[PDB]
Structure formats: C-alpha cells, structure tokens
Amino acid sequence: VDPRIQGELEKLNQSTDDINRRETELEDARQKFRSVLVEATVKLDELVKKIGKAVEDSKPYWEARRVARQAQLEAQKATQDFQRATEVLRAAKETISLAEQRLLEDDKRQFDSAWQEMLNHATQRVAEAEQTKTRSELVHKETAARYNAAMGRMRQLEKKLKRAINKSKPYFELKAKYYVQLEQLKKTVDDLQAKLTLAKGEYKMALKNLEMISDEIHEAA
C-alpha cells in the first residue's frame, strides 16, 4: 500500500531534518562554550603574571572563608533546631502545668475523664522532649563555637594578608563572572544534546515502524 509507507516516510523525513538543526544548534553551543572557556583562561593568566604572589598568599584566607561559610550554616541549623526543641518542652510544660492544677486533689472534677488523656500523653513526651532538647542544646554549643572560631581565623588572616586580599579580589570576581557564564553555556550544551537524543530516538522508531509496515504489506496475498 503506497499510502501506508509514505505516511511513515514523511514522518521519518520531518524527524531527520529536525536533527540537522539540533546537530548544529549543539555544535554552535559547543563551540561558543570552547571560545569562552579559552578566553577565560588566557585573561586570567595575564592577570596572574602581572601580580600573582597575592593570589597564592590569599588562598589561606579564602579557604578560611570557605570553612566559615560551612560553619555558619551548621550553626544556623543548630540554632533553628534548638529553637524547636525549646518549643516542644515548653508546650509539654504548659500542657502539664495547666492540667496539673485542675486534676490534682480533684477540687474541680470537670472533664476529669478527658484531662489525664492529654496529661499522660504529655507525661510520655516530656521524657523524650528533655532528652532531645538537651541534645540539640549541647550541639548548639558545639556549632556556635565552631562558627565563631572559624571567623577568628579569617579575621586574623584578613589582618595578616589584607594587601594580598585586596589585589586578588578583582581576580576572583572576573573568574566568577566567567564561571557563571561558562556555567550558563555548560547547561545549554548539556540539555540541547539530550534534546537531540530524544530527537534521534524518535527518528529510529520510524525505521522500525517501516520495518513492520513493509512486513505487514509483505504478508498480504
């Protein structure tokens, strides 16, 4: 059946012509990635060759800053986890203290069937609430120490290398501007090719639809 195959032919023909774009749109994005990559390294080398001692001397400071960025997130999460651990023990103390007066000696005996049901639930949680609160608190002592200790090294190094630091700041930022640009080009290249794989994939599926259709026509009469 001449129409049966021509329906897959043009379905295959449109898919393979789309690939010719994708192969260029990838190669173009790939080459531009190469071009920015090589310019990034040569403009940064000239900046090192001028005055590059400041760069190596600044590395102990920037590492001491890298350590600090970590310790401050650790301290913040320990801060927020301690803020939660206090709020549970409080709600457990408020629940118990409020329920204590009503039930003790049963001077009031109102909803006395229901009050303990909340008090005993509270009684059980306090055992764990006090465990976990002391836990997060002690960890908060560790992290807040590590935090304000990592700052002390960075600050003292800032005093000890402030000259080298102020000269390497333009170097790191032109490196960062180029990085994020390269990061931008790296992202565009990576998904543009996977887009082609799904394009090539849908092309190869046509060659099987034809391998079967021609086989379906053949097994007729």
Residue numbers in the entry: 41 to 261
Article sentences:
The Rab11 subfamily plays important roles in specific trafficking events such as exocytosis, endosomal recycling, and cytokinesis. SH3BP5 and SH3BP5-like (SH3BP5L) proteins have recently been found to serve as guanine nucleotide exchange factors (GEF) for Rab11. SH3BP5 exhibits a V-shaped structure comprising two coiled coils. The coiled coil composed of α1, and α4 is solely responsible for the Rab11a binding and GEF activity.
Because computational secondary structure prediction assigned the N- and C-terminal regions as mostly disordered regions, we selected the central helical region for crystallography. We found that the R260A/R261A/R262A triple mutation reduced the degradation and obtained diffraction-quality crystals. This construct of SH3BP5 (41–266; R260A/R261A/R262A) is hereafter referred to as SH3BP5-RA. In addition, the M167A mutation was introduced to improve the solubility of the selenomethionine (SeMet)-labeled SH3BP5-RA (SeMet SH3BP5-RA/M167A), which was used for phase determination by the single-wavelength anomalous diffraction method. Finally, we determined the crystal structures of SeMet SH3BP5-RA/M167A in two different crystal forms (I41 and P41) and native SH3BP5-RA at 3.35, 3.6, and 3.8 Å resolutions, respectively. The asymmetric units of the I41 and P41 crystals contain one and two SH3BP5 molecules, respectively. Therefore, we obtained five different apo-SH3BP5 structures in total (i.e., one from I41 SeMet SH3BP5-RA/M167A, two from P41 SeMet SH3BP5-RA/M167A, and two from P41 native SH3BP5-RA). Although these five apo-SH3BP5 structures exhibit a similar V-shaped conformation, the superposition of these five apo-SH3BP5 structures using α1 as the reference shows some flexibility of the conformation. The hinge region of the V shape contains staggered hydrophobic interactions so as to maintain the V shape.
